[PDB]
Amino acid sequence: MDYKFWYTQPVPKINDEFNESVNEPFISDNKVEDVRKDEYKLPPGYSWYVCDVKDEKDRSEIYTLLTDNYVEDDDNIFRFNYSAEFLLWALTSPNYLKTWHIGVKYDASNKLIGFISAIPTDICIHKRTIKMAEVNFLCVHKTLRSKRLAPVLIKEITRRINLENIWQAIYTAGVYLPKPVSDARYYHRSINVKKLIEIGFSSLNSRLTMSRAIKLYRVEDTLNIKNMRLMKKKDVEGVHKLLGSYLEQFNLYAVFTKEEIAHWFLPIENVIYTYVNEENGKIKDMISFYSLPSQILGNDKYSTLNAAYSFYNVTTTATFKQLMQDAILLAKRNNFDVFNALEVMQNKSVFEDLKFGEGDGSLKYYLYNWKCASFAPAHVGIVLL
Ligand SMILES: CCCCCCCCCCCCCC(=O)CSCCNC(=O)CCNC(=O)[C@H](O)C(C)(C)COP(=O)(O)OP(=O)(O)OC[C@H]1O[C@@H](n2cnc3c(N)ncnc32)[C@H](O)[C@@H]1OP(=O)(O)O
Ligand SMILES: Cc1c(C(=O)CCc2ccccc2)oc2cccc(OC3CCNCC3)c12
Ligand SMILES: [Cl-]
Ligand SMILES: [Mg+2]
């Protein structure tokens, strides 16, 4: 297929491949003064709207649009159902701009029918740190698909981002676009085996009976690392040092400030869970994962699959396998049905032994206006939401 929109943008062509030593923008020497000051045109009867995510009622409208129209699995059995409070956390990180939270309304109903967002973050790509926008929650209402609205959303946020003298973005999608810098399969570890069977997610066979399936996935309710505990404000500096050091080995990662650590890690029920092991007042090991339920479409008995998504995990006192086994246990202890991760960082190495199953597709990582060698997902050190 043709990429008639993407090919007009500063991203690689589908055939482009770059040496390791290439690491630079497609278009350099950009000037804020030259950026269009006019909003991009929407079709007749539709308007831009600046969402205030801190306002319960605006935040709810975004919640509704995503609950009804956001990403579905290939088989349209499941639809991501990010919670309102999770969207608050995801969009109000350090230095967020309200004007990067862009909705589109249909004038006559006053209804939100589109959305796109970005937050600022410093991104280290092949050892060069660059200020970028992380883009997420692009969504057009199901009733308005394939009408070329999405490039309008993209072009408008790009314009707003450029106004802040920012010229690169990072983003992820399951769809293949020009052109990933990396590609990571997702893996899933069953926690509530029976529920996962009943909604079709997992399956049985003549050898794996229901009772045998339950037994296979049984976990012991005892932590390998005894003192692993919810993170507290006191733990911010330790976490910053532990994580910040660990992340330097990767080809792609966020450079977190102390302020970004407190925001991205301090726990929030039903949103973010971070656990630490403190020894001698030092943080030596951490586990984290975020909550991302999916709505279950057309199952008579269950309407929600609660799922925990591996975020950042670092051990210096245990094996990485022992640490992730603890991450599974803490997710079970918090009522999650399943523990999801990507084959990024060291993850892949523990998936077989910990009984993860390979999923159906993969998550592509993309950069905007950035030219560089692609790499295997083990070299990816950032997890987007
Ligand atoms: C320096 C700053 C730079 C800032 C910007 C950085 C870039 C940020 C990029 C965004 C990052 C988002 C990351 C993110 O949020 C995580 S990926 C999740 C995206 N959201 C969903 O999948 C929700 C369900 N689907 C929808 O809502 C609609 O299908 C959407 C809105 C996806 C498209 O609506 P539509 O009604 O289906 O489509 P048209 O309007 O007709 O438009 C079609 C054009 O859209 C291209 N398309 C489709 N899906 C895309 C996707 N996921 N990324 C980028 N492009 C995507 C497509 O290839 C085509 O271009 P082409 O003709 O060249 O092929
Ligand atoms: C997208 C995804 C999946 C999936 O299985 C994608 C298919 C799906 C879509 C909607 C509802 C349920 C399933 O598994 C993951 C396991 C780990 C991380 C993942 O990606 C995250 C980062 C980008 N946004 C979604 C979560 C994923
Ligand atoms: Cl244009
Ligand atoms: Mg459209």
CSV table of C-alpha atoms and ligand atoms in Angstrom, one decimal:
chain,number,residue,atom,x,y,z
A,1,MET,CA,0.0,0.0,0.0
A,2,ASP,CA,0.8,3.6,-0.7
A,3,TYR,CA,1.3,5.8,2.4
A,4,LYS,CA,0.0,8.8,0.6
A,5,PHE,CA,0.1,10.8,3.8
A,6,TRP,CA,3.1,9.3,5.6
A,7,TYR,CA,5.3,9.8,2.5
A,8,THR,CA,4.8,13.6,2.7
A,9,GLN,CA,6.3,13.5,6.3
A,10,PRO,CA,10.0,13.5,7.5
A,11,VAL,CA,10.1,9.7,8.3
A,12,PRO,CA,11.9,7.0,6.5
A,13,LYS,CA,10.5,5.4,3.3
A,14,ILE,CA,9.5,1.7,3.7
A,15,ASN,CA,12.8,0.7,1.9
A,16,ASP,CA,15.2,3.0,3.9
A,17,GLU,CA,17.9,1.4,6.0
A,18,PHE,CA,20.6,3.4,7.8
A,19,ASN,CA,24.1,2.7,9.1
A,20,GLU,CA,24.8,2.6,12.8
A,21,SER,CA,26.7,5.8,12.5
A,22,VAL,CA,23.7,7.8,11.1
A,23,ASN,CA,21.8,9.5,13.9
A,24,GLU,CA,20.3,12.8,13.0
A,25,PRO,CA,17.0,14.6,12.0
A,26,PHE,CA,15.6,14.2,8.5
A,27,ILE,CA,15.1,18.1,8.5
A,28,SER,CA,17.5,20.2,10.5
A,29,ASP,CA,17.7,23.9,11.3
A,30,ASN,CA,14.0,24.3,11.9
A,31,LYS,CA,12.8,27.8,13.0
A,32,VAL,CA,9.9,28.4,15.4
A,33,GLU,CA,9.3,31.7,13.6
A,34,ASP,CA,8.3,29.8,10.4
A,35,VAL,CA,5.7,27.5,11.9
A,36,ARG,CA,2.2,28.0,10.7
A,37,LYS,CA,0.1,30.0,13.3
A,38,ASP,CA,-3.2,29.0,11.8
A,39,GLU,CA,-5.1,25.8,12.9
A,40,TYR,CA,-5.4,23.1,10.2
A,41,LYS,CA,-8.8,23.1,8.5
A,42,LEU,CA,-11.4,20.6,9.6
A,43,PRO,CA,-14.3,19.6,7.5
A,44,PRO,CA,-17.5,21.6,7.6
A,45,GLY,CA,-19.4,21.3,11.0
A,46,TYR,CA,-16.4,20.3,13.1
A,47,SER,CA,-14.2,22.4,15.4
A,48,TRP,CA,-11.1,22.1,17.4
A,49,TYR,CA,-11.5,22.0,21.2
A,50,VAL,CA,-8.8,22.4,23.8
A,51,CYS,CA,-9.5,19.7,26.5
A,52,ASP,CA,-8.7,20.4,30.1
A,53,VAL,CA,-7.7,16.9,31.4
A,54,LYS,CA,-7.8,18.3,34.9
A,55,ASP,CA,-11.4,19.1,34.7
A,56,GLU,CA,-13.5,16.1,35.6
A,57,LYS,CA,-16.2,16.7,32.9
A,58,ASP,CA,-13.7,17.3,30.0
A,59,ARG,CA,-11.7,14.3,31.2
A,60,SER,CA,-14.9,12.2,31.1
A,61,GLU,CA,-15.6,13.1,27.5
A,62,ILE,CA,-12.2,11.9,26.5
A,63,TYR,CA,-12.8,8.7,28.6
A,64,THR,CA,-16.1,8.2,26.8
A,65,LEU,CA,-14.6,8.7,23.3
A,66,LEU,CA,-11.8,6.2,24.0
A,67,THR,CA,-14.0,3.7,25.9
A,68,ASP,CA,-16.2,3.4,22.7
A,69,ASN,CA,-13.7,3.9,19.9
A,70,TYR,CA,-10.2,3.2,20.9
A,71,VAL,CA,-7.9,0.1,20.0
A,72,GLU,CA,-9.3,-3.3,19.6
A,73,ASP,CA,-7.6,-6.7,19.1
A,74,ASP,CA,-7.6,-8.2,15.6
A,75,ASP,CA,-10.6,-10.3,16.4
A,76,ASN,CA,-12.6,-7.4,17.9
A,77,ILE,CA,-13.2,-9.3,21.2
A,78,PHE,CA,-11.5,-6.8,23.4
A,79,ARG,CA,-11.2,-2.9,23.5
A,80,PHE,CA,-8.8,-1.1,25.6
A,81,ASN,CA,-10.5,0.8,28.4
A,82,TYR,CA,-8.0,3.2,29.9
A,83,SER,CA,-9.5,4.7,33.1
A,84,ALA,CA,-10.2,8.4,33.6
A,85,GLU,CA,-7.8,8.6,36.4
A,86,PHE,CA,-5.1,6.8,34.3
A,87,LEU,CA,-5.7,9.4,31.5
A,88,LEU,CA,-5.2,12.2,34.1
A,89,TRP,CA,-1.8,10.7,35.1
A,90,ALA,CA,-0.8,9.9,31.6
A,91,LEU,CA,-1.4,13.5,30.4
A,92,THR,CA,-0.2,15.7,33.3
A,93,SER,CA,3.4,14.7,33.7
A,94,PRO,CA,6.1,17.3,34.3
A,95,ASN,CA,5.9,20.3,31.9
A,96,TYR,CA,2.8,19.1,30.1
A,97,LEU,CA,1.0,21.5,27.9
A,98,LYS,CA,-2.8,21.7,28.0
A,99,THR,CA,-2.7,22.9,24.3
A,100,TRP,CA,-1.2,19.5,23.3
A,101,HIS,CA,-4.5,17.8,24.4
A,102,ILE,CA,-6.5,18.3,21.3
A,103,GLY,CA,-10.1,17.2,20.7
A,104,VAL,CA,-12.4,17.7,17.8
A,105,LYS,CA,-16.2,18.3,18.3
A,106,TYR,CA,-19.1,17.9,16.0
A,107,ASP,CA,-20.6,21.3,16.3
A,108,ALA,CA,-24.3,20.3,16.2
A,109,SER,CA,-24.2,17.7,19.0
A,110,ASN,CA,-21.4,19.4,20.9
A,111,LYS,CA,-19.9,15.8,21.1
A,112,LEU,CA,-16.2,15.0,21.1
A,113,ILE,CA,-15.5,12.8,18.0
A,114,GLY,CA,-11.7,12.9,17.8
A,115,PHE,CA,-8.7,13.3,20.1
A,116,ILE,CA,-4.8,13.3,19.9
A,117,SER,CA,-2.3,14.1,22.7
A,118,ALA,CA,1.4,14.6,23.4
A,119,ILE,CA,3.5,15.2,26.4
A,120,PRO,CA,7.2,16.4,26.5
A,121,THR,CA,10.0,14.0,27.4
A,122,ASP,CA,13.8,13.9,26.8
A,123,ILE,CA,14.6,10.9,24.6
A,124,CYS,CA,18.0,9.3,24.3
A,125,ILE,CA,18.3,7.6,20.8
A,126,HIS,CA,21.7,6.0,20.1
A,127,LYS,CA,23.4,8.1,22.9
A,128,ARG,CA,22.1,11.5,21.8
A,129,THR,CA,19.4,13.1,24.0
A,130,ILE,CA,16.8,15.0,22.2
A,131,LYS,CA,13.7,16.9,23.5
A,132,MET,CA,10.7,15.2,22.0
A,133,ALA,CA,6.9,14.8,22.2
A,134,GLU,CA,5.5,11.4,23.1
A,135,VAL,CA,2.2,11.1,21.2
A,136,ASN,CA,-0.6,8.8,22.3
A,137,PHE,CA,-4.4,8.3,22.3
A,138,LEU,CA,-5.1,9.3,18.7
A,139,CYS,CA,-8.7,8.3,18.2
A,140,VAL,CA,-11.4,9.0,15.6
A,141,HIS,CA,-15.0,8.0,16.3
A,142,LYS,CA,-16.0,4.7,14.7
A,143,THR,CA,-18.7,6.4,12.7
A,144,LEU,CA,-16.1,8.7,11.0
A,145,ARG,CA,-13.4,6.3,10.0
A,146,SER,CA,-11.5,6.5,6.7
A,147,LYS,CA,-12.3,10.1,6.0
A,148,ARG,CA,-8.7,11.4,6.3
A,149,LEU,CA,-9.4,13.0,9.8
A,150,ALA,CA,-6.3,11.3,11.4
A,151,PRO,CA,-3.8,13.2,9.3
A,152,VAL,CA,-5.5,16.4,10.3
A,153,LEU,CA,-5.1,15.5,14.0
A,154,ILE,CA,-1.4,14.6,13.3
A,155,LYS,CA,-0.6,17.7,11.4
A,156,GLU,CA,-2.2,19.9,14.0
A,157,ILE,CA,-0.4,18.4,16.9
A,158,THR,CA,2.8,18.6,15.0
A,159,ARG,CA,2.2,22.2,14.4
A,160,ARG,CA,1.6,22.8,18.1
A,161,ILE,CA,4.6,20.9,19.1
A,162,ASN,CA,6.8,22.8,16.6
A,163,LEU,CA,5.7,26.1,18.2
A,164,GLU,CA,7.5,25.0,21.4
A,165,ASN,CA,10.8,24.5,19.3
A,166,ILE,CA,10.4,20.7,19.5
A,167,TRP,CA,11.0,18.8,16.1
A,168,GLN,CA,11.0,15.1,17.0
A,169,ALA,CA,8.3,12.8,18.5
A,170,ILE,CA,8.2,9.2,19.6
A,171,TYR,CA,5.1,7.0,19.3
A,172,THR,CA,4.0,3.4,19.1
A,173,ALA,CA,1.3,1.5,17.2
A,174,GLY,CA,0.3,-2.1,16.3
A,175,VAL,CA,-0.1,-1.0,12.7
A,176,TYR,CA,2.8,-1.0,10.3
A,177,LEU,CA,3.8,2.6,9.2
A,178,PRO,CA,6.9,4.1,7.7
A,179,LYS,CA,9.1,3.0,9.5
A,180,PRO,CA,9.7,1.3,12.8
A,181,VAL,CA,13.0,1.9,14.6
A,182,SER,CA,12.1,-1.3,16.5
A,183,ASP,CA,9.4,-4.0,16.7
A,184,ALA,CA,8.4,-5.8,19.9
A,185,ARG,CA,6.0,-8.8,20.3
A,186,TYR,CA,3.9,-8.8,23.3
A,187,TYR,CA,3.7,-11.8,25.7
A,188,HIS,CA,1.0,-12.6,28.3
A,189,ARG,CA,1.2,-14.5,31.6
A,190,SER,CA,-2.1,-16.0,32.7
A,191,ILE,CA,-3.1,-15.2,36.4
A,192,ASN,CA,-6.9,-16.1,36.4
A,193,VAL,CA,-6.7,-19.0,34.1
A,194,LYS,CA,-10.4,-20.0,34.4
A,195,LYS,CA,-11.6,-16.5,33.5
A,196,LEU,CA,-9.2,-16.2,30.6
A,197,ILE,CA,-10.6,-19.6,29.3
A,198,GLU,CA,-14.3,-18.5,29.7
A,199,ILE,CA,-13.8,-15.3,27.6
A,200,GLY,CA,-11.9,-17.2,24.9
A,201,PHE,CA,-8.5,-15.6,25.6
A,202,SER,CA,-6.8,-18.9,26.6
A,203,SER,CA,-7.6,-22.5,25.6
A,204,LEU,CA,-7.8,-26.1,26.9
A,205,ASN,CA,-7.3,-29.4,25.1
A,206,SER,CA,-7.5,-33.1,25.8
A,207,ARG,CA,-4.2,-33.1,27.7
A,208,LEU,CA,-4.8,-29.7,29.4
A,209,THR,CA,-8.0,-30.1,31.3
A,210,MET,CA,-9.4,-27.2,33.2
A,211,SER,CA,-8.0,-28.5,36.6
A,212,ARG,CA,-4.6,-29.0,34.9
A,213,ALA,CA,-4.6,-25.5,33.4
A,214,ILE,CA,-5.3,-24.0,36.8
A,215,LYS,CA,-2.5,-26.0,38.4
A,216,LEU,CA,0.0,-25.0,35.7
A,217,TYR,CA,-0.4,-21.3,36.4
A,218,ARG,CA,-0.6,-21.6,40.2
A,219,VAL,CA,1.8,-19.2,42.0
A,220,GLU,CA,3.2,-19.4,45.6
A,221,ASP,CA,2.1,-16.4,47.6
A,222,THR,CA,5.6,-15.6,48.9
A,223,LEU,CA,7.9,-13.0,47.5
A,224,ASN,CA,11.5,-14.0,46.4
A,225,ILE,CA,12.6,-10.6,47.7
A,226,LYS,CA,11.0,-10.4,51.1
A,227,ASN,CA,11.1,-6.6,51.7
A,228,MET,CA,9.7,-5.6,48.3
A,229,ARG,CA,7.1,-2.8,49.3
A,230,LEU,CA,5.0,-0.1,47.7
A,231,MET,CA,7.1,2.9,46.7
A,232,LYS,CA,6.9,6.0,48.9
A,233,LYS,CA,8.0,9.7,48.3
A,234,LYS,CA,11.1,9.0,50.4
A,235,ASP,CA,12.2,6.5,47.6
A,236,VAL,CA,12.2,9.0,44.7
A,237,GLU,CA,16.0,9.8,44.8
A,238,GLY,CA,16.9,6.0,45.1
A,239,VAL,CA,14.6,5.0,42.2
A,240,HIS,CA,16.0,7.9,40.1
A,241,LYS,CA,19.6,6.6,40.6
A,242,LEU,CA,18.7,2.9,40.2
A,243,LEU,CA,16.5,3.3,37.1
A,244,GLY,CA,18.5,6.1,35.6
A,245,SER,CA,21.7,4.1,35.7
A,246,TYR,CA,20.1,0.9,34.4
A,247,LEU,CA,18.5,2.6,31.4
A,248,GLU,CA,21.8,4.0,30.0
A,249,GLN,CA,22.7,0.6,28.4
A,250,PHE,CA,19.8,0.8,25.9
A,251,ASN,CA,19.6,2.3,22.4
A,252,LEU,CA,16.3,4.1,23.1
A,253,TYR,CA,15.1,5.3,26.5
A,254,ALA,CA,13.7,8.3,28.4
A,255,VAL,CA,16.0,10.5,30.4
A,256,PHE,CA,14.0,10.9,33.6
A,257,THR,CA,14.4,13.9,36.0
A,258,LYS,CA,13.7,13.4,39.7
A,259,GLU,CA,10.3,15.2,39.0
A,260,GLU,CA,9.5,12.7,36.3
A,261,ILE,CA,10.4,9.8,38.6
A,262,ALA,CA,7.9,10.9,41.2
A,263,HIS,CA,5.2,11.4,38.6
A,264,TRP,CA,5.8,8.2,36.7
A,265,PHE,CA,6.3,6.0,39.7
A,266,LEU,CA,4.7,7.0,42.9
A,267,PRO,CA,1.7,4.6,43.1
A,268,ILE,CA,-1.9,5.4,42.3
A,269,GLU,CA,-4.5,2.7,42.9
A,270,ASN,CA,-5.8,1.3,39.7
A,271,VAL,CA,-3.3,3.2,37.6
A,272,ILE,CA,0.4,2.7,38.6
A,273,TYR,CA,2.0,0.1,41.0
A,274,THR,CA,5.7,0.6,41.9
A,275,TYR,CA,7.4,-1.7,44.6
A,276,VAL,CA,11.0,-1.2,45.9
A,277,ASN,CA,13.5,-3.1,48.0
A,278,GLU,CA,15.4,-0.8,50.3
A,279,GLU,CA,18.6,-1.9,52.0
A,280,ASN,CA,20.6,0.4,54.1
A,281,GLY,CA,18.4,3.3,53.0
A,282,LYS,CA,19.3,2.5,49.3
A,283,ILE,CA,16.9,1.3,46.7
A,284,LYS,CA,18.4,-1.9,45.2
A,285,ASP,CA,15.6,-3.5,43.2
A,286,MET,CA,12.3,-2.2,41.7
A,287,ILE,CA,9.2,-3.6,40.1
A,288,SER,CA,6.5,-1.6,38.3
A,289,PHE,CA,3.4,-2.2,36.2
A,290,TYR,CA,0.4,-0.1,35.1
A,291,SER,CA,-3.3,-1.0,35.0
A,292,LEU,CA,-5.0,-1.1,31.5
A,293,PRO,CA,-8.3,-3.0,31.5
A,294,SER,CA,-9.9,-4.1,28.3
A,295,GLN,CA,-13.6,-4.1,27.9
A,296,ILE,CA,-14.8,-7.5,26.8
A,297,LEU,CA,-17.2,-7.3,23.9
A,298,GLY,CA,-20.2,-9.7,23.8
A,299,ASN,CA,-19.3,-12.1,26.6
A,300,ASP,CA,-22.4,-12.7,28.6
A,301,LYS,CA,-20.7,-13.3,32.0
A,302,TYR,CA,-17.6,-10.9,32.1
A,303,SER,CA,-17.4,-7.2,30.9
A,304,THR,CA,-13.8,-6.3,32.0
A,305,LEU,CA,-10.5,-8.0,31.7
A,306,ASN,CA,-8.2,-6.4,34.3
A,307,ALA,CA,-4.6,-6.5,33.0
A,308,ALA,CA,-1.2,-5.3,34.4
A,309,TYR,CA,1.4,-4.2,32.0
A,310,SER,CA,5.1,-4.5,32.9
A,311,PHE,CA,6.6,-1.1,33.1
A,312,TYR,CA,10.2,-0.8,34.5
A,313,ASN,CA,11.9,-3.6,36.5
A,314,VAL,CA,15.5,-3.5,37.8
A,315,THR,CA,17.2,-6.0,40.1
A,316,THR,CA,20.7,-5.9,41.7
A,317,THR,CA,20.1,-8.4,44.5
A,318,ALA,CA,18.2,-11.2,42.7
A,319,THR,CA,18.1,-12.8,39.2
A,320,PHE,CA,15.8,-11.0,36.8
A,321,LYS,CA,13.7,-14.1,36.6
A,322,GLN,CA,13.1,-14.0,40.4
A,323,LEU,CA,12.2,-10.3,40.1
A,324,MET,CA,9.6,-10.8,37.4
A,325,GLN,CA,8.2,-13.8,39.3
A,326,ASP,CA,7.7,-11.3,42.1
A,327,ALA,CA,6.1,-8.8,39.7
A,328,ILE,CA,3.6,-11.5,38.7
A,329,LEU,CA,2.8,-12.3,42.3
A,330,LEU,CA,2.3,-8.6,43.1
A,331,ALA,CA,0.0,-8.3,40.1
A,332,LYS,CA,-2.0,-11.4,41.4
A,333,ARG,CA,-2.2,-9.8,44.8
A,334,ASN,CA,-3.7,-6.8,43.2
A,335,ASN,CA,-6.6,-8.7,41.5
A,336,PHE,CA,-5.2,-8.6,37.9
A,337,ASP,CA,-6.3,-11.4,35.5
A,338,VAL,CA,-3.2,-11.4,33.3
A,339,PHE,CA,0.3,-9.9,33.3
A,340,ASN,CA,1.4,-8.5,29.9
A,341,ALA,CA,4.9,-7.6,28.8
A,342,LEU,CA,6.9,-6.7,25.7
A,343,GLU,CA,10.1,-8.4,24.5
A,344,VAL,CA,12.0,-5.2,25.4
A,345,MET,CA,15.0,-4.8,27.7
A,346,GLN,CA,15.8,-8.1,29.4
A,347,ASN,CA,12.2,-9.3,29.3
A,348,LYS,CA,12.3,-12.0,26.6
A,349,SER,CA,14.8,-14.0,28.6
A,350,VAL,CA,12.3,-14.9,31.4
A,351,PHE,CA,9.1,-15.5,29.3
A,352,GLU,CA,9.5,-19.3,28.7
A,353,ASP,CA,10.4,-20.1,32.3
A,354,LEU,CA,7.7,-17.9,33.8
A,355,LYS,CA,5.0,-19.5,31.5
A,356,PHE,CA,4.3,-16.5,29.3
A,357,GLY,CA,2.4,-17.2,26.1
A,358,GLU,CA,3.3,-15.5,22.8
A,359,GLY,CA,0.7,-13.0,21.7
A,360,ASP,CA,-0.9,-12.4,18.2
A,361,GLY,CA,1.0,-9.3,16.9
A,362,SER,CA,3.6,-6.8,17.8
A,363,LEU,CA,4.1,-3.2,18.9
A,364,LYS,CA,6.1,-1.0,16.5
A,365,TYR,CA,8.3,1.8,17.9
A,366,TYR,CA,8.5,4.9,15.7
A,367,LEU,CA,10.4,8.2,15.7
A,368,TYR,CA,9.2,11.3,13.8
A,369,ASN,CA,11.9,13.4,12.0
A,370,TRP,CA,14.7,11.1,13.1
A,371,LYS,CA,17.0,9.0,10.9
A,372,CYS,CA,19.0,6.1,12.5
A,373,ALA,CA,19.7,2.3,12.3
A,374,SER,CA,16.9,0.1,13.5
A,375,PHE,CA,17.6,-2.4,16.3
A,376,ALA,CA,16.3,-5.6,17.9
A,377,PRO,CA,13.7,-4.9,20.8
A,378,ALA,CA,16.1,-6.1,23.5
A,379,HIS,CA,17.8,-2.7,22.8
A,380,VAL,CA,14.6,-0.8,23.4
A,381,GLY,CA,14.5,0.7,27.0
A,382,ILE,CA,11.4,2.7,27.1
A,383,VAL,CA,7.7,1.5,27.6
A,384,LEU,CA,4.9,3.8,26.4
A,385,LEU,CA,1.5,3.7,27.7
B,1,LIG,C1,7.8,16.9,15.9
B,1,LIG,C2,6.4,16.5,16.4
B,1,LIG,C3,5.7,15.4,15.5
B,1,LIG,C4,4.3,15.1,16.0
B,1,LIG,C5,3.5,13.9,15.4
B,1,LIG,C6,4.2,12.5,15.5
B,1,LIG,C7,3.4,11.4,14.8
B,1,LIG,C8,2.3,10.9,15.5
B,1,LIG,C9,1.5,9.8,14.8
B,1,LIG,C10,0.3,9.3,15.5
B,1,LIG,C11,0.7,8.4,16.7
B,1,LIG,C12,-0.4,7.8,17.4
B,1,LIG,C13,0.0,6.7,18.4
B,1,LIG,C14,-1.1,6.2,19.2
B,1,LIG,O1,-2.0,6.8,19.5
B,1,LIG,C15,-1.0,4.7,19.7
B,1,LIG,S1,-1.5,3.7,18.3
B,1,LIG,C16,-3.3,3.8,18.5
B,1,LIG,C17,-4.1,4.6,17.5
B,1,LIG,N1,-5.4,4.6,17.8
B,1,LIG,C18,-6.2,3.6,17.4
B,1,LIG,O2,-5.8,2.7,16.8
B,1,LIG,C19,-7.7,3.8,17.8
B,1,LIG,C20,-8.6,3.0,16.9
B,1,LIG,N2,-8.5,3.6,15.5
B,1,LIG,C21,-8.8,4.8,15.3
B,1,LIG,O3,-9.2,5.5,16.1
B,1,LIG,C22,-8.7,5.2,13.8
B,1,LIG,O4,-8.4,4.1,13.1
B,1,LIG,C23,-7.4,6.1,13.6
B,1,LIG,C24,-7.6,7.5,14.4
B,1,LIG,C25,-6.3,5.4,14.1
B,1,LIG,C26,-7.2,6.4,12.2
B,1,LIG,O5,-8.3,7.0,11.5
B,1,LIG,P1,-8.9,6.4,10.3
B,1,LIG,O6,-10.2,6.9,10.2
B,1,LIG,O7,-8.6,5.1,10.3
B,1,LIG,O8,-7.9,6.9,9.1
B,1,LIG,P2,-8.0,8.2,8.3
B,1,LIG,O9,-8.4,9.2,9.1
B,1,LIG,O10,-8.6,7.9,7.2
B,1,LIG,O11,-6.5,8.4,8.0
B,1,LIG,C27,-5.6,7.5,7.5
B,1,LIG,C28,-4.1,7.8,7.6
B,1,LIG,O12,-3.8,7.6,8.9
B,1,LIG,C29,-2.8,6.7,9.1
B,1,LIG,N3,-2.8,6.0,10.4
B,1,LIG,C30,-3.7,5.1,10.8
B,1,LIG,N4,-3.4,4.7,12.0
B,1,LIG,C31,-2.4,5.4,12.4
B,1,LIG,C32,-1.7,5.4,13.7
B,1,LIG,N5,-2.0,4.6,14.6
B,1,LIG,N6,-0.6,6.2,13.7
B,1,LIG,C33,-0.3,7.0,12.7
B,1,LIG,N7,-0.9,7.0,11.6
B,1,LIG,C34,-2.0,6.2,11.4
B,1,LIG,C35,-2.9,5.8,7.9
B,1,LIG,O13,-1.8,5.0,7.7
B,1,LIG,C36,-3.2,6.7,6.8
B,1,LIG,O14,-2.1,7.3,6.3
B,1,LIG,P3,-1.5,6.9,4.8
B,1,LIG,O15,-2.4,7.2,3.9
B,1,LIG,O16,-0.2,7.5,4.6
B,1,LIG,O17,-1.2,5.5,5.0
B,2,LIG,C1,-1.0,-3.5,22.4
B,2,LIG,C2,-0.6,-4.7,23.3
B,2,LIG,C3,-1.1,-5.9,23.4
B,2,LIG,C4,-2.2,-6.6,22.5
B,2,LIG,O1,-2.4,-7.7,22.7
B,2,LIG,C5,-2.8,-5.8,21.3
B,2,LIG,C6,-4.2,-6.4,20.9
B,2,LIG,C7,-5.3,-5.9,21.8
B,2,LIG,C8,-5.9,-4.7,21.6
B,2,LIG,C9,-6.9,-4.2,22.5
B,2,LIG,C10,-7.3,-4.9,23.6
B,2,LIG,C11,-6.6,-6.1,23.9
B,2,LIG,C12,-5.6,-6.6,23.0
B,2,LIG,O2,-0.5,-6.7,24.2
B,2,LIG,C13,0.5,-5.9,24.8
B,2,LIG,C14,1.4,-6.2,25.8
B,2,LIG,C15,2.3,-5.3,26.3
B,2,LIG,C16,2.3,-4.0,25.8
B,2,LIG,C17,1.4,-3.6,24.7
B,2,LIG,O3,1.4,-2.3,24.3
B,2,LIG,C18,1.2,-1.2,25.2
B,2,LIG,C19,1.9,0.1,24.7
B,2,LIG,C20,1.1,0.8,23.6
B,2,LIG,N1,-0.4,0.9,24.0
B,2,LIG,C21,-1.0,-0.3,24.5
B,2,LIG,C22,-0.2,-1.0,25.6
B,2,LIG,C23,0.5,-4.6,24.3
B,3,CL,CL,-1.2,20.3,4.5
B,4,MG,MG,-11.2,9.6,9.4
